[PDB]
Design a protein around this nucleic acid. Structure first.
Ligand SMILES: *C(=O)c1cnc2ccccc2n1
Ligand SMILES: *C(=O)c1cnc2ccccc2n1
Ligand SMILES: *C(=O)c1cnc2ccccc2n1
Ligand SMILES: *C(=O)c1cnc2ccccc2n1
Ligand SMILES: [Mn+2]
Ligand SMILES: [Mn+2]
Ligand SMILES: [Mn+2]
Lengths: 8, 8
DNA sequence: ACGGCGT
DNA sequence: ACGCCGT
């Protein structure tokens, strides 16, 4: 759920 | 029902 | 009845 | 360096 690199 | 990773 | 990620 | 859900 977090998007820091992927944003799933 | 929500699809945030599975979407059932 | 449902599980996932890359810069 | 990052954590989330509803029909
Ligand atoms: C989002 O909050 C989140 C939490 N855990 C994960 C584990 C594996 C892949 C993606 C994820 N996303
Ligand atoms: C994004 O691509 C990414 C990759 N590795 C991580 C490790 C820890 C926190 C956030 C990250 N984000
Ligand atoms: C969707 O709204 C939803 C709600 N509760 C669940 C529980 C278990 C599996 C899937 C679900 N989906
Ligand atoms: C998606 O794969 C997924 C997995 N675990 C979760 C836990 C809490 C909220 C959303 C989630 N999504
Ligand atoms: Mn699960
Ligand atoms: Mn990775
Ligand atoms: Mn719920």
């Amino acid at each position: 759920x977090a998007x820091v690199x992927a944003x799933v």
